[PDB]
């Protein structure tokens, strides 16, 4: 229990530093979409952000997003190892695991969104910017139930 | 219908108007992302078919770092994403450069968005320009905008909220210049421009309000609960309503004398309210002491020439007119003799809303006493003296005459304010036959 | 968004500019590689004012290093951050000027002017919206006083709009490390005063003084003595790259501060300066700033503010903070020292606040203060110049170029005029 | 489908073209055995343009080697990609050039020219639809201009209306490596200007300098100094065989850059030139690629382009981009360098693009420029000629070979006329 | 599991390079059919493509044969990974049948849109459809496994 709270607080501190650079993250994604010729579709997955970073990239802020998603995914594994859980904690953990899955569709996900234009929030980045804060809330709720 | 547009120009506009929309969106059931989980909102909202409302706003300035955190805040999603107008290079507290060199590259697209907003909704009646006399982009850039909206839109009413430099508290040194260079344009192309300083907001946050160490967040919030109260009956029902077109015919005696104050008198801390009830007869007595007047001038040296009493909440109209007649008996509040009627009230059915996480207390009563006075006669004449001793040997003229504009406009200021100071003594005299 | 271009010229100006790019980068997070490994997102969104983006996710500073000898720069390659510079920026000569204003401005400056101004144009017109030109030099030796005077003679003509921010490490009052440095200094200011926009003045004796009295260090090294002047010049720029409640540009601090066109020489300062023992004995709030910044122990020039009157005072605060303390304290210091300030200026002091402090520090400040106490510096420099000039001593080189006798009487004539107008 | 014809004569032009066929193989993916091993099929649709198809899956070139010495030819069979070349092209004689134009052209020039032109005629009718010529000559050599201006002059009573490209390594009048070279030089321009169409002026002096600074090499040798003109001309002959977004041909170029009959002279160029030390610090994008091509120290002149305005400019891009990048980045350079483009062209630059990058890069380009600055090269060769000539030196040799002192009089007389027109329109 | 995914990705990369040369593959097959005097029948098997190749065109035929050989080896690696389920075993048997040397491809249709209607119906529609269909069944097999 103490270790997973310390891990969550460490991820929250990294996420605060990432959130201060949200405009640089959006500019990084837009330049990668330009180089990919992929301006038509929303950014729908963590895997798409990774593909942009590897082939079309800004790289530092994309790495910071990927590192936070990796640490959230590892923290889900640590929650599973702590206890067999309850219907509530298991439902929260499964939501976290689904959201931090590489290929999960984020296109409809909305929490960070208020810093986007209505077009960017609806059609481009509203999903991906909403991922981390929503997963952090479910992990806090999971701890509070556990 | 009953509508107006709000223009936030300058940093003293866009920061003050940053704090007004959170109350405004929490004035109603609109969750602040843009949607709503009742035709009241449409005065300051242009509703779309998707359910999203659009705030009536435009944000024009020459600095990029002040508009950008709104574009990265939580109100990038409530707002339509390209009236957040943003320049590149700064006027930076120079009057001649936000008006004749750098602001002129962005003007024609501002008025385009003005025409775009005005021609969607039919019943325009006024404008809410948020600015000040304290900088370059809030002062000189606006001094062209107030003569665009007047000659081109005819006789539409237009209202401003501009702060005023205090005699002791002023951040910039050139602030004696760009105030008096702004006022050559104000009297001829406006209807009202209310006054406040920054110092007297702090004292009410110390004395009547308990919470010490005031940032700009709590200081903005006090003007946020005042411009709500001017527009309180446009969006809501009332026992006795006030619109906005009649404000220009009964608060304004003379063709130059249109500079009144405001007094949100029930301002009170959460625990200070628990040891003093807020009944209406002691509500209206909080307007008239010199401690709660929002400008650092003494009301006991001048004559009032009008008043107004905008109430809200659980106000029966029987306490108000009884409390009207008691203040007429007093001698410490004196009126000029060519106004025997004096007074004016408005009552409404809605309680004022305190901001959650805020520093006021929940009530069911309020007063916003907007009135004019003779007391601003001395406040004008002191800043003519600060203008004089800097122009006595032409101190900061090399950031102005080098921008391609004559010294002669500094001469027209002394033609302006001296000819606009004798009026407070000419027609401010006794009854002469 | 509004980029300013940074130069270092001459071994005095090169060395103090050599330290900037390690401190400014750790105010943003750029590693010794050149990559970004920061923690927060706000420390990239205005990165382009001192940077050019490059492919691969690497940034690069915009230092245009210029000298006349190859000895100075080969240490700068070998320094800690010598691998993050664009190698075409290092431009240098082969034959020494050697502490001469005649060589730095006429002999060996007439040949390598064009191979450097092309690199000036190759960085200037290729970036979006320019805002300034930070040049680090002094009046001490012959290169950095002679080559920087020749360099800015064109920068104000092919680029006559932008703000020229020249810097100066003015010679020490007691002695300095040259024997002809009055000639190196009074020739520099002959063309500085009418042509630049605003000049900083740095004193090298007061570099040493404020590390023993206030920081109590036993080993004052030039690696540490430039770390303090890097903290001030990175402060005037802390609102271009960070937000705040009331933010300050460079010109916004220039149009307010400068009263008259020809009087643009400043005096830096810096508030949190705590000894290694006194760390645990000092509180961090605004009344520990206005006393520690406004005192003569913290100013950086050979002036006597008790003998003079401040024209204008600037004070850029930093850290998220509550600013009635900034208002009401600097009301009081205005109202206490009524004879320290001039009287025809009604209100004097300009406040500015940031929101992100120096790394690991709770809060800081930065002082830039105009004074009418620096005329005796220009009196004593132009007095000891006239001690050397009266017997025509050390005219062995300047006569040899063919420069007339009429050249060196004009710099003394116009340094009578400036010191007659600080009295004004 | 538009096949094209390559020849060479001289020392350098017989070896620069021996660096061409290495470059085009790697663009196409051709092994030393003649077997194709390229990756993409988008090139195989137009493999016929330069290479002749050969039976069995092999692919064979069509260039013609002709010179009077065996040695420089025998270097090519010693070369890396000199093994795919066709064996009956190698027509080699026995005699000595002596760096003499008198023996490359008039004395010995009657014999082997009739024996090599009919092998061109044995390849001209063989192709489907012919396009043009690549004769690769040193200007003013013994086998350089002795066989250069002769060979294409006798073509023109067969092909009057066909395009022609030549890679003329210009003498660069600062210093020269032959004492009789201005005598060899001014007779080439005697017979070309009424006949020649597009010459590529190649300075070795400029390419000694740009391999020194904008490449920063340590030992630039002729095995790589020929490369930077070898890869330049492949961009011109790429839009013939590769699809693009606004594609181009060589006759599209000739309408664009020959306003008067006399003014048709070119400066080549290649866009992404950056040293190995500062590649990772740099980002390869369009608004910085455009700055390399238009640097006045980048094009291959031994002259400054400041005095010389530009008639008409062409640039062939490669790789995938957008075009209002290029359409604006055209329009910008007229606005600021308005005294560097003549007023009497409405659209001063032809802009052409393509779709496929070179190997090892994401995108590239190629600069092709035409000036009013080359007349300082054209005056000074005559200036180092007429200093050698007014003293009546070396006349009895050519008189013994047939060439009088009468012939040398019209050469400066016509270059009085030709070099006037770069100067006349400076107002 | 990781090894068979890496093998499949390697085959997909080779198939992308082959697909860019599809017109050269068709021209290779047509010239072989001309030399064989076998223009009447569809190309119905991998063995027929091999016979054509044996008795630039040769390089693209080898690339087709190499991809089919690697697909056949990848089926053997799938069989060795687990005893499977009715679903994975049905997918694997379809893959093994399709990559068998003598299996009839004449009716197989996925690459077909780059052919004329006659070429797609009567000549090459089978053989060009083989690789992409087998790659889909192998992806589906991995996703079930």
mmCIF file of C-alpha atoms in Angstrom, chain D residues 132-424:
data_model
loop_
_atom_site.group_PDB
_atom_site.id
_atom_site.type_symbol
_atom_site.label_atom_id
_atom_site.label_comp_id
_atom_site.label_asym_id
_atom_site.label_seq_id
_atom_site.Cartn_x
_atom_site.Cartn_y
_atom_site.Cartn_z
ATOM 1 C CA UNK D 132 18.832 14.773 -76.803
ATOM 2 C CA UNK D 133 22.554 14.919 -76.260
ATOM 3 C CA UNK D 134 25.089 14.721 -73.401
ATOM 4 C CA UNK D 135 28.588 15.551 -74.710
ATOM 5 C CA UNK D 136 30.979 15.787 -71.789
ATOM 6 C CA UNK D 137 33.999 17.915 -72.709
ATOM 7 C CA UNK D 138 36.705 19.911 -71.029
ATOM 8 C CA UNK D 139 36.534 23.376 -72.524
ATOM 9 C CA UNK D 140 39.756 24.085 -74.376
ATOM 10 C CA UNK D 141 41.508 20.715 -74.318
ATOM 11 C CA UNK D 142 43.386 18.796 -76.966
ATOM 12 C CA UNK D 143 40.889 15.979 -76.906
ATOM 13 C CA UNK D 144 38.592 18.326 -74.977
ATOM 14 C CA UNK D 145 37.550 21.000 -77.471
ATOM 15 C CA UNK D 146 39.357 19.399 -80.399
ATOM 16 C CA UNK D 147 36.539 16.881 -80.660
ATOM 17 C CA UNK D 148 33.831 18.807 -78.810
ATOM 18 C CA UNK D 149 32.839 21.651 -81.109
ATOM 19 C CA UNK D 150 33.575 19.536 -84.175
ATOM 20 C CA UNK D 151 31.319 16.587 -83.397
ATOM 21 C CA UNK D 152 28.007 18.342 -82.698
ATOM 22 C CA UNK D 153 28.542 20.877 -85.486
ATOM 23 C CA UNK D 154 28.341 18.140 -88.118
ATOM 24 C CA UNK D 155 25.246 16.654 -86.457
ATOM 25 C CA UNK D 156 23.063 19.660 -87.259
ATOM 26 C CA UNK D 157 22.459 18.778 -90.908
ATOM 27 C CA UNK D 158 20.678 15.677 -89.544
ATOM 28 C CA UNK D 159 18.944 16.947 -86.365
ATOM 29 C CA UNK D 160 18.129 20.660 -86.642
ATOM 30 C CA UNK D 161 15.476 20.844 -83.919
ATOM 31 C CA UNK D 162 16.752 18.631 -81.095
ATOM 32 C CA UNK D 163 17.835 19.432 -77.550
ATOM 33 C CA UNK D 164 21.447 19.239 -76.400
ATOM 34 C CA UNK D 165 23.222 19.272 -73.025
ATOM 35 C CA UNK D 166 26.947 19.630 -72.481
ATOM 36 C CA UNK D 167 29.095 19.697 -69.351
ATOM 37 C CA UNK D 168 31.783 22.224 -70.190
ATOM 38 C CA UNK D 169 34.440 22.429 -67.462
ATOM 39 C CA UNK D 170 35.078 26.148 -67.848
ATOM 40 C CA UNK D 171 38.684 27.437 -67.638
ATOM 41 C CA UNK D 172 38.066 29.711 -64.562
ATOM 42 C CA UNK D 173 40.427 32.576 -65.493
ATOM 43 C CA UNK D 174 42.267 32.946 -62.150
ATOM 44 C CA UNK D 175 44.825 30.237 -63.016
ATOM 45 C CA UNK D 176 45.061 27.454 -65.593
ATOM 46 C CA UNK D 177 46.975 24.188 -65.977
ATOM 47 C CA UNK D 178 47.951 24.586 -69.657
ATOM 48 C CA UNK D 179 49.989 27.315 -71.323
ATOM 49 C CA UNK D 180 48.129 26.984 -74.641
ATOM 50 C CA UNK D 181 44.663 26.729 -73.034
ATOM 51 C CA UNK D 182 43.344 30.241 -74.027
ATOM 52 C CA UNK D 183 44.338 29.338 -77.582
ATOM 53 C CA UNK D 184 42.345 26.166 -77.019
ATOM 54 C CA UNK D 185 39.532 28.104 -75.325
ATOM 55 C CA UNK D 186 38.478 30.938 -77.629
ATOM 56 C CA UNK D 187 38.028 28.725 -80.683
ATOM 57 C CA UNK D 188 35.450 26.640 -78.810
ATOM 58 C CA UNK D 189 33.280 29.724 -78.212
ATOM 59 C CA UNK D 190 33.938 30.671 -81.855
ATOM 60 C CA UNK D 191 31.816 27.788 -83.143
ATOM 61 C CA UNK D 192 29.463 27.017 -80.257
ATOM 62 C CA UNK D 193 27.449 30.241 -79.792
ATOM 63 C CA UNK D 194 25.704 30.004 -83.150
ATOM 64 C CA UNK D 195 25.034 26.296 -82.457
ATOM 65 C CA UNK D 196 25.162 25.335 -78.758
ATOM 66 C CA UNK D 197 22.039 25.124 -76.629
ATOM 67 C CA UNK D 198 22.724 24.514 -72.908
ATOM 68 C CA UNK D 199 26.240 24.344 -71.501
ATOM 69 C CA UNK D 200 26.877 23.570 -67.840
ATOM 70 C CA UNK D 201 29.689 25.838 -66.666
ATOM 71 C CA UNK D 202 31.757 23.762 -64.218
ATOM 72 C CA UNK D 203 34.461 25.438 -62.139
ATOM 73 C CA UNK D 204 37.001 23.233 -60.447
ATOM 74 C CA UNK D 205 38.109 26.313 -58.496
ATOM 75 C CA UNK D 206 34.632 26.780 -57.007
ATOM 76 C CA UNK D 207 34.422 23.082 -56.196
ATOM 77 C CA UNK D 208 37.848 23.220 -54.576
ATOM 78 C CA UNK D 209 36.278 25.794 -52.250
ATOM 79 C CA UNK D 210 32.820 24.355 -51.537
ATOM 80 C CA UNK D 211 34.266 20.960 -50.777
ATOM 81 C CA UNK D 212 36.550 22.833 -48.379
ATOM 82 C CA UNK D 213 33.940 24.898 -46.461
ATOM 83 C CA UNK D 214 30.300 23.880 -46.932
ATOM 84 C CA UNK D 215 31.392 20.237 -46.870
ATOM 85 C CA UNK D 216 34.576 20.513 -44.721
ATOM 86 C CA UNK D 217 36.600 17.696 -46.215
ATOM 87 C CA UNK D 218 40.218 16.868 -45.427
ATOM 88 C CA UNK D 219 41.511 15.290 -48.685
ATOM 89 C CA UNK D 220 39.303 16.266 -51.646
ATOM 90 C CA UNK D 221 40.583 14.178 -54.547
ATOM 91 C CA UNK D 222 39.341 13.768 -58.122
ATOM 92 C CA UNK D 223 37.590 10.496 -57.288
ATOM 93 C CA UNK D 224 35.131 12.591 -55.271
ATOM 94 C CA UNK D 225 35.512 16.063 -56.787
ATOM 95 C CA UNK D 226 33.791 14.757 -59.922
ATOM 96 C CA UNK D 227 30.914 13.469 -57.751
ATOM 97 C CA UNK D 228 29.443 16.872 -56.945
ATOM 98 C CA UNK D 229 28.810 17.570 -60.623
ATOM 99 C CA UNK D 230 28.014 13.876 -61.213
ATOM 100 C CA UNK D 231 25.023 13.870 -58.855
ATOM 101 C CA UNK D 232 23.924 17.367 -59.932
ATOM 102 C CA UNK D 233 22.851 16.541 -63.505
ATOM 103 C CA UNK D 234 20.827 13.486 -62.418
ATOM 104 C CA UNK D 235 18.180 15.785 -60.956
ATOM 105 C CA UNK D 236 17.599 17.413 -64.337
ATOM 106 C CA UNK D 237 17.147 14.016 -66.018
ATOM 107 C CA UNK D 238 14.877 12.628 -63.273
ATOM 108 C CA UNK D 239 11.547 14.285 -64.136
ATOM 109 C CA UNK D 240 11.868 12.601 -67.539
ATOM 110 C CA UNK D 241 11.674 9.170 -65.901
ATOM 111 C CA UNK D 242 10.051 9.788 -62.544
ATOM 112 C CA UNK D 243 6.507 11.014 -61.871
ATOM 113 C CA UNK D 244 6.104 14.268 -60.047
ATOM 114 C CA UNK D 245 3.544 16.833 -59.003
ATOM 115 C CA UNK D 246 4.457 19.440 -61.659
ATOM 116 C CA UNK D 247 6.739 17.450 -63.933
ATOM 117 C CA UNK D 248 9.319 18.725 -66.396
ATOM 118 C CA UNK D 249 11.254 17.856 -69.562
ATOM 119 C CA UNK D 250 14.398 19.273 -71.139
ATOM 120 C CA UNK D 251 12.440 21.172 -73.772
ATOM 121 C CA UNK D 252 10.331 22.594 -70.947
ATOM 122 C CA UNK D 253 13.624 23.979 -69.639
ATOM 123 C CA UNK D 254 14.803 25.356 -72.988
ATOM 124 C CA UNK D 255 11.716 27.522 -73.548
ATOM 125 C CA UNK D 256 12.169 28.863 -70.028
ATOM 126 C CA UNK D 257 15.872 29.829 -70.186
ATOM 127 C CA UNK D 258 16.711 30.901 -73.755
ATOM 128 C CA UNK D 259 15.209 34.398 -74.243
ATOM 129 C CA UNK D 260 17.611 35.651 -76.915
ATOM 130 C CA UNK D 261 19.483 33.260 -79.248
ATOM 131 C CA UNK D 262 22.812 34.000 -77.551
ATOM 132 C CA UNK D 263 22.087 33.936 -73.785
ATOM 133 C CA UNK D 264 21.811 30.273 -72.721
ATOM 134 C CA UNK D 265 24.538 29.562 -70.139
ATOM 135 C CA UNK D 266 24.159 27.694 -66.825
ATOM 136 C CA UNK D 267 25.460 27.368 -63.235
ATOM 137 C CA UNK D 268 24.524 24.046 -61.613
ATOM 138 C CA UNK D 269 23.847 23.218 -57.958
ATOM 139 C CA UNK D 270 22.759 20.587 -55.423
ATOM 140 C CA UNK D 271 20.661 21.399 -52.384
ATOM 141 C CA UNK D 272 21.279 19.408 -49.144
ATOM 142 C CA UNK D 273 25.027 19.988 -48.759
ATOM 143 C CA UNK D 274 25.996 19.773 -45.088
ATOM 144 C CA UNK D 275 29.121 18.487 -43.344
ATOM 145 C CA UNK D 276 29.032 15.210 -41.420
ATOM 146 C CA UNK D 277 29.774 17.074 -38.180
ATOM 147 C CA UNK D 278 26.624 19.214 -38.251
ATOM 148 C CA UNK D 279 24.014 16.871 -39.738
ATOM 149 C CA UNK D 280 22.295 15.714 -36.535
ATOM 150 C CA UNK D 281 22.078 19.303 -35.277
ATOM 151 C CA UNK D 282 20.249 20.224 -38.488
ATOM 152 C CA UNK D 283 16.652 19.597 -39.558
ATOM 153 C CA UNK D 284 15.984 18.726 -43.207
ATOM 154 C CA UNK D 285 12.927 20.764 -44.167
ATOM 155 C CA UNK D 286 11.791 22.988 -47.020
ATOM 156 C CA UNK D 287 12.366 26.519 -45.562
ATOM 157 C CA UNK D 288 16.022 25.689 -44.860
ATOM 158 C CA UNK D 289 16.642 23.734 -48.071
ATOM 159 C CA UNK D 290 15.670 26.879 -49.972
ATOM 160 C CA UNK D 291 18.352 28.873 -48.151
ATOM 161 C CA UNK D 292 21.169 26.547 -49.281
ATOM 162 C CA UNK D 293 20.340 26.795 -52.995
ATOM 163 C CA UNK D 294 20.210 30.591 -53.051
ATOM 164 C CA UNK D 295 23.415 31.227 -51.126
ATOM 165 C CA UNK D 296 25.827 33.165 -53.327
ATOM 166 C CA UNK D 297 28.711 30.948 -52.222
ATOM 167 C CA UNK D 298 26.792 27.765 -53.101
ATOM 168 C CA UNK D 299 26.490 27.891 -56.895
ATOM 169 C CA UNK D 300 29.503 26.837 -58.882
ATOM 170 C CA UNK D 301 30.813 30.169 -60.199
ATOM 171 C CA UNK D 302 34.255 31.696 -60.027
ATOM 172 C CA UNK D 303 32.416 35.013 -59.851
ATOM 173 C CA UNK D 304 30.247 37.021 -57.536
ATOM 174 C CA UNK D 305 26.522 37.130 -58.426
ATOM 175 C CA UNK D 306 26.233 40.672 -57.004
ATOM 176 C CA UNK D 307 27.031 42.493 -60.255
ATOM 177 C CA UNK D 308 25.121 39.954 -62.303
ATOM 178 C CA UNK D 309 21.350 39.826 -62.286
ATOM 179 C CA UNK D 310 19.579 36.645 -63.339
ATOM 180 C CA UNK D 311 17.501 36.267 -66.492
ATOM 181 C CA UNK D 312 15.655 33.046 -65.692
ATOM 182 C CA UNK D 313 16.121 30.466 -62.939
ATOM 183 C CA UNK D 314 15.116 26.803 -62.744
ATOM 184 C CA UNK D 315 15.040 24.386 -59.824
ATOM 185 C CA UNK D 316 14.040 20.718 -59.848
ATOM 186 C CA UNK D 317 12.958 19.368 -56.470
ATOM 187 C CA UNK D 318 12.756 15.726 -55.392
ATOM 188 C CA UNK D 319 10.936 14.004 -52.573
ATOM 189 C CA UNK D 320 7.488 14.700 -51.139
ATOM 190 C CA UNK D 321 6.564 18.219 -50.014
ATOM 191 C CA UNK D 322 3.822 20.791 -50.403
ATOM 192 C CA UNK D 323 3.968 23.412 -53.115
ATOM 193 C CA UNK D 324 2.675 26.662 -51.603
ATOM 194 C CA UNK D 325 5.827 26.301 -49.569
ATOM 195 C CA UNK D 326 7.725 26.504 -52.858
ATOM 196 C CA UNK D 327 5.238 28.872 -54.517
ATOM 197 C CA UNK D 328 5.712 31.387 -51.714
ATOM 198 C CA UNK D 329 9.438 30.670 -51.376
ATOM 199 C CA UNK D 330 9.654 31.526 -55.029
ATOM 200 C CA UNK D 331 7.763 34.767 -54.445
ATOM 201 C CA UNK D 332 9.832 35.870 -51.449
ATOM 202 C CA UNK D 333 13.193 35.976 -53.214
ATOM 203 C CA UNK D 334 11.930 38.337 -55.918
ATOM 204 C CA UNK D 335 10.725 40.748 -53.213
ATOM 205 C CA UNK D 336 13.995 41.182 -51.315
ATOM 206 C CA UNK D 337 16.600 40.549 -54.034
ATOM 207 C CA UNK D 338 14.670 42.714 -56.482
ATOM 208 C CA UNK D 339 17.868 44.327 -57.766
ATOM 209 C CA UNK D 340 19.247 40.820 -58.400
ATOM 210 C CA UNK D 341 16.454 39.759 -60.777
ATOM 211 C CA UNK D 342 15.975 41.721 -64.000
ATOM 212 C CA UNK D 343 12.709 43.600 -64.373
ATOM 213 C CA UNK D 344 12.000 42.169 -67.827
ATOM 214 C CA UNK D 345 10.900 38.675 -66.736
ATOM 215 C CA UNK D 346 7.411 38.495 -65.166
ATOM 216 C CA UNK D 347 7.873 35.161 -63.358
ATOM 217 C CA UNK D 348 11.599 34.978 -62.686
ATOM 218 C CA UNK D 349 11.887 31.314 -61.604
ATOM 219 C CA UNK D 350 10.591 28.092 -63.098
ATOM 220 C CA UNK D 351 9.797 25.718 -60.235
ATOM 221 C CA UNK D 352 9.560 21.985 -60.859
ATOM 222 C CA UNK D 353 9.082 19.163 -58.368
ATOM 223 C CA UNK D 354 9.103 15.377 -58.248
ATOM 224 C CA UNK D 355 8.059 12.572 -55.906
ATOM 225 C CA UNK D 356 11.018 10.236 -55.241
ATOM 226 C CA UNK D 357 14.025 11.183 -53.065
ATOM 227 C CA UNK D 358 17.626 10.126 -53.656
ATOM 228 C CA UNK D 359 19.069 7.187 -51.780
ATOM 229 C CA UNK D 360 20.147 8.115 -48.257
ATOM 230 C CA UNK D 361 17.895 11.180 -47.902
ATOM 231 C CA UNK D 362 14.241 12.068 -47.410
ATOM 232 C CA UNK D 363 14.175 14.866 -50.002
ATOM 233 C CA UNK D 364 16.495 16.867 -52.245
ATOM 234 C CA UNK D 365 16.589 19.405 -55.089
ATOM 235 C CA UNK D 366 18.920 20.676 -57.838
ATOM 236 C CA UNK D 367 19.717 24.298 -58.723
ATOM 237 C CA UNK D 368 20.111 25.498 -62.337
ATOM 238 C CA UNK D 369 20.917 29.179 -62.761
ATOM 239 C CA UNK D 370 21.382 31.639 -65.622
ATOM 240 C CA UNK D 371 22.916 35.048 -64.980
ATOM 241 C CA UNK D 372 24.278 38.326 -66.214
ATOM 242 C CA UNK D 373 27.521 37.554 -64.392
ATOM 243 C CA UNK D 374 29.282 35.027 -66.644
ATOM 244 C CA UNK D 375 30.589 37.768 -68.975
ATOM 245 C CA UNK D 376 33.414 38.459 -66.515
ATOM 246 C CA UNK D 377 34.526 34.884 -67.133
ATOM 247 C CA UNK D 378 33.957 35.430 -70.861
ATOM 248 C CA UNK D 379 35.880 38.699 -70.979
ATOM 249 C CA UNK D 380 38.907 37.487 -69.044
ATOM 250 C CA UNK D 381 39.598 34.344 -71.062
ATOM 251 C CA UNK D 382 39.789 36.704 -74.019
ATOM 252 C CA UNK D 383 41.951 38.951 -71.820
ATOM 253 C CA UNK D 384 44.419 36.131 -71.177
ATOM 254 C CA UNK D 385 44.048 35.195 -74.844
ATOM 255 C CA UNK D 386 44.704 38.655 -76.304
ATOM 256 C CA UNK D 387 47.739 39.152 -74.074
ATOM 257 C CA UNK D 388 49.081 35.929 -75.595
ATOM 258 C CA UNK D 389 47.903 36.955 -79.067
ATOM 259 C CA UNK D 390 48.808 40.627 -79.614
ATOM 260 C CA UNK D 391 52.485 39.602 -79.504
ATOM 261 C CA UNK D 392 51.752 37.193 -82.434
ATOM 262 C CA UNK D 393 52.918 34.112 -80.554
ATOM 263 C CA UNK D 394 52.329 30.475 -81.649
ATOM 264 C CA UNK D 395 51.079 31.352 -85.150
ATOM 265 C CA UNK D 396 53.372 29.346 -87.430
ATOM 266 C CA UNK D 397 52.292 26.073 -85.796
ATOM 267 C CA UNK D 398 48.615 26.495 -86.653
ATOM 268 C CA UNK D 399 49.640 27.942 -90.031
ATOM 269 C CA UNK D 400 51.589 24.732 -90.598
ATOM 270 C CA UNK D 401 48.438 22.923 -89.476
ATOM 271 C CA UNK D 402 46.395 25.241 -91.738
ATOM 272 C CA UNK D 403 44.865 27.705 -89.285
ATOM 273 C CA UNK D 404 45.817 31.258 -90.199
ATOM 274 C CA UNK D 405 46.177 34.414 -88.150
ATOM 275 C CA UNK D 406 43.024 35.457 -90.020
ATOM 276 C CA UNK D 407 40.874 33.017 -87.998
ATOM 277 C CA UNK D 408 41.977 34.350 -84.598
ATOM 278 C CA UNK D 409 40.781 37.852 -85.519
ATOM 279 C CA UNK D 410 37.057 37.023 -85.564
ATOM 280 C CA UNK D 411 37.185 35.247 -82.185
ATOM 281 C CA UNK D 412 37.624 38.417 -80.147
ATOM 282 C CA UNK D 413 35.560 40.259 -82.776
ATOM 283 C CA UNK D 414 32.583 37.988 -82.116
ATOM 284 C CA UNK D 415 33.226 37.904 -78.368
ATOM 285 C CA UNK D 416 33.108 41.680 -78.624
ATOM 286 C CA UNK D 417 29.547 41.132 -79.836
ATOM 287 C CA UNK D 418 28.570 38.270 -77.492
ATOM 288 C CA UNK D 419 29.799 39.696 -74.161
ATOM 289 C CA UNK D 420 28.119 43.034 -74.913
ATOM 290 C CA UNK D 421 24.608 41.661 -74.330
ATOM 291 C CA UNK D 422 25.173 40.623 -70.709
ATOM 292 C CA UNK D 423 26.215 44.269 -70.191
ATOM 293 C CA UNK D 424 23.680 46.110 -72.413
#
